[PDB]
Design a protein around this ligand. Structure first.
Ligand SMILES: *[C@@H]1O[C@H](CO)[C@@H](O)[C@H](O)[C@H]1NC(C)=O
Ligand SMILES: *[C@@H]1O[C@H](CO)[C@@H](O)[C@H](O)[C@H]1NC(C)=O
Ligand SMILES: *[C@@H]1O[C@H](CO)[C@@H](O)[C@H](O)[C@H]1NC(C)=O
Ligand SMILES: *[C@@H]1O[C@H](CO)[C@@H](O)[C@H](O)[C@H]1NC(C)=O
Ligand SMILES: [Ca+2]
Ligand SMILES: [Ca+2]
Lengths: 494, 492
């Protein structure tokens, strides 16, 4: 029997958020114990500076420019799947839970989907057998006229809406959702163990603004409300790992912990995390925006308490999971995700590139110790003056710019080992620069020459496609009348 | 027999420099193992933003404002003990090794002293039995006419100078000094074990610019030359701890690892370290400047792999070390250092203040989770425009200022748990501010009212008092003719 696969994907948790990663308050004892019992990656990356594209990248093993999860409305624009998005995960894309049933896996998603809320994009049409969670974020409350409250699903149908059946108290921070998500995880593990190999995709979002926690966790953290949620998630993960040992299935269960993008610094200090020593955060292709905590745990197989400097990608979880299943990735398409099993089980290292996209633009690329920025951007001057700062307290001259800066002729290159905070660009005249420039540009142009970008899914929005009347609304008496509208170009970043 | 005391004090190593503290390259496996076998402090502080005052503070258990290691030449100015300094540690201060002598200890300093280079300030006049190292930094090379190359001592006499008998190659970064310092430590431990309780003050300085490492460590770090030095020091520390275990004296040996101030960000990225998530570094009273890595290791006594959020001071090593020897601190004077043994052995927490001084000025104070800045300063506008940046890549509005800013009447208060990088001052109108303000001001007032500052030791410099002719130069033929000069006010 192939090993069970458990993917713990956090929302907006940064590289500096775990005790073992250097968080000063040391409030993640369970994750620290996971690290001590497994392998830790200090050089691990997501696939985009925000939620939806990274989640799509995880589930396809493919960059958002291949899987369609980007916009072309303007250059280097972050896009995702809000309630009004017309597109979503195309039928042409092959998702991990779809492929895993070739080895008899039963798959469940717990938490946030973000690959499209419309009927054709439902997770149960894309490989998952079970679902408890929302297709969208947990923002609200809405007035149900300008936009509807966001639905929570069980499998095919909604069981309620956020701020209705699923209360989130914005004054106090109280919500029971992480406890519900935990119980959904445990119930599924118990039902599947010694019956079918299982894949659990545990995509919680308590750490995404507005942040929440169950009452016993509120006010327990030295990091305010954000820390409260982290302690609750850490505790929950502890109980998940304990269940696997109690059912004597731990040694046949591979568990990976990571996050979908960097800490949301616009929400710091009370509602957002830390990116440790790294520059900026969510929305940017600086290290703080795409470098993530990443732990692997598989007792009797992954040697305990080790560290690997393998350049890792969230997309590698696709290809690695297939390898654990005894399966092969699709052969009719580019697959960016690499098989990490030699790294995980034998301590091997693979010389691979990490490409950093923002929308339609390859902003940066890392090979070995070096990173070249072909483009730089934080956010526009207009947004910055309105108080939106992606890099609070931070300013690196000619690097953190409010204009989309074209460095394609002379890439800004950093040595990440010597300069994790991207503070000191290499001299253009140096031998080290020339070597790095030729090595990285070679790999980038090979990538681009082989790339035929997918059509963008995130260009079009429609007021009428919001969650007015999700399936299951009728019986609950919760259907809302949609407004009259036409599809139109989404307005990004504003 | 009281337990052995081993204090490992780094020069310019930051909070973000150890793997276990979050350094991404994870290049300190021996120190990480020390942490796993002992106790880690995430909230530990030095006593000043630079070398000499912090070292004076360690060995006296007393703030620089009390022990004399500050200047009054101007307000809030960093001062230390360069070669031209006239003063140094006064006879009136009681140093740790002086006081340990009572209990049968034999004490050795290995490495950098920095408490005065003149004959009356010699460490062997101040409680140490043995010495291998230098009174000063390892800057050079000098021409031996305008400045003399810095001497290295064995006990009472110089055995050579840096860039002469003790080469430091600035082109490559090669020097054997850390290996020599390791050997000095090992030899001392072998000699004292089963004979006398030992106190070893191991004060290496390879991580201080200009950074150096022995050949086998050069080019081995992903952090460049600074990282090479760190790897060597880490390796040396592993060998020290292994010796204590191999001699079967580990269980009777208390060892502490810390640093004297934050990373020197003027020397980064090649010759300076990391302060992790904290603001600025060396020379400032922001967290990056005075928050330090801190490990305690005492097998069988300190429970392995634990973390304590005890607000700790480098000064505490004075009082704690006395408590280890079964001794009480001086009773005729204020002592800032606290006995940390109940923390170390029983896991206790003491509600103590951390005061942050820069020169003659109390810049900031931390109580619990809150830090109040009464004054802010990085460096002057003139120095900044000349390329000196204590906070590269960093700018916090109204916080990181190039003027010495008076906030005495409305302190900038930060919640350190929520905001380690001191990015978000608390609103002056909040209830949290008001509570923190009253709590912190109370303890600051109590401190200031009971304080009579010592006369400053770091005001006066004299060209003629530099190391022209250290004791031992005559037999070596290394005495240099000094210039003519008069004592004058130092330029800080
Ligand atoms: C959370 O769950 C507990 C039961 O465990 C219940 O008493 C409480 O009302 C719930 N709170 C909310 C806000 O739903
Ligand atoms: C960042 O620093 C540069 C160089 O000193 C300066 O010109 C610029 O104004 C700074 N940017 C901001 C937003 O303060
Ligand atoms: C360091 O010592 C080795 C022998 O152990 C010697 O070959 C080398 O020249 C020495 N280097 C310096 C700079 O003293
Ligand atoms: C720091 O930020 C403030 C406020 O934006 C600005 O006035 C100042 O120019 C900045 N300083 C530098 C060196 O960038
Ligand atoms: Ca996210
Ligand atoms: Ca120092």
């Amino acid at each position: 029997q192939p090993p069970n696969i458990l993917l713990l994907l956090m929302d907006d948790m940064g590289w500096g958020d775990l005790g073992v990663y250097g968080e000063p308050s040391r409030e993640t004892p369970n994750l620290d114990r996971m690290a001590a019992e497994g392998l830790l990656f200090p050089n691990f990356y997501s696939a985009n500076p925000l939620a939806s594209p990274s989640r799509a990248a995880l589930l396809t093993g493919r960059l958002p420019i291949r899987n369609g999860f980007y916009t072309t409305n303007a250059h280097a624009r972050n896009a995702y799947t809000p309630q009004e998005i017309v597109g979503g995960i195309p039928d042409s894309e092959q998702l991990l839970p779809e492929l895993l049933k070739k080895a008899g896996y039963v798959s469940k998603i717990v938490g946030k989907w973000h690959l499209g809320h419309r009927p054709q994009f439902h997770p149960l049409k894309h490989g998952f057998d079970e679902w408890f969670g929302s297709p969208n974020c947990h923002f609200g409350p809405y007035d149900n006229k300008a936009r509807p409250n966001i639905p929570v699903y069980r499998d095919w149908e909604m069981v309620g809406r956020y701020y209705e059946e699923f209360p989130i108290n914005l004054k106090t921070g109280e919500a029971n959702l992480t406890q519900i998500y935990l119980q959904e995880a445990l119930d599924f593990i118990k039902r599947q163990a010694r019956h079918h190999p299982f894949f659990l995709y545990w995509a919680v979002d308590a750490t995404h603004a507005p942040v929440y926690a169950s009452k016993p966790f509120l006010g327990t953290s030295q990091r305010g409300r954000y820390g409260d949620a982290v302690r609750e998630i850490d505790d929950s993960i502890g109980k998940i790992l304990e269940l696997l040992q109690d059912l004597h299935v731990a040694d046949n269960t591979f568990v990976f912990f990571t996050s979908d993008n960097g800490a949301a610094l616009i929400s710091a200090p009370e509602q957002g995390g830390s990116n440790g020593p790294f520059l900026c955060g969510k929305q940017t292709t600086f290290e703080g925006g795409m470098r993530e905590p990443a732990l692997a745990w598989w007792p009797g197989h992954v040697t305990a308490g080790q560290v690997s400097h393998q350049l890792g990608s969230i997309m590698d979880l696709f290809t690695t999971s297939l390898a654990l299943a005894g399966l092969t990735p699709p052969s009719d398409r580019a697959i960016d995700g690499l098989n990490l099993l030699p790294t995980l089980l034998q301590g091997r290292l693979m010389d691979r590139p990490i490409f950093y996209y923002r929308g339609d633009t390859l902003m940066a690329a890392t090979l070995g110790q070096h990173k070249a920025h072909f483009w730089t951007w934080t956010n526009s001057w207009e947004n910055f003056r309105q108080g939106i700062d992606f890099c609070p307290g931070q300013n690196v001259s000619g690097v953190t710019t409010h204009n989309l800066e074209d460095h394609t002729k002379l890439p800004l290159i950093f040595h990440l080992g010597r300069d994790p905070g991207e503070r000191f660009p290499l001299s253009f005249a140096s031998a080290e620069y020339q070597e790095a420039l030729s090595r990285i540009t070679s790999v980038v142009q090979q990538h681009q020459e082989a790339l035929v970008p997918a059509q963008p899914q995130l260009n079009v929005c429609n007021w009428a496609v919001m969650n007015w009347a999700p399936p299951g609304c009728e019986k609950l008496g919760k259907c809302l009348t949609p407004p009259e509208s036409i599809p139109k170009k989404c307005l990004w970043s504003h």
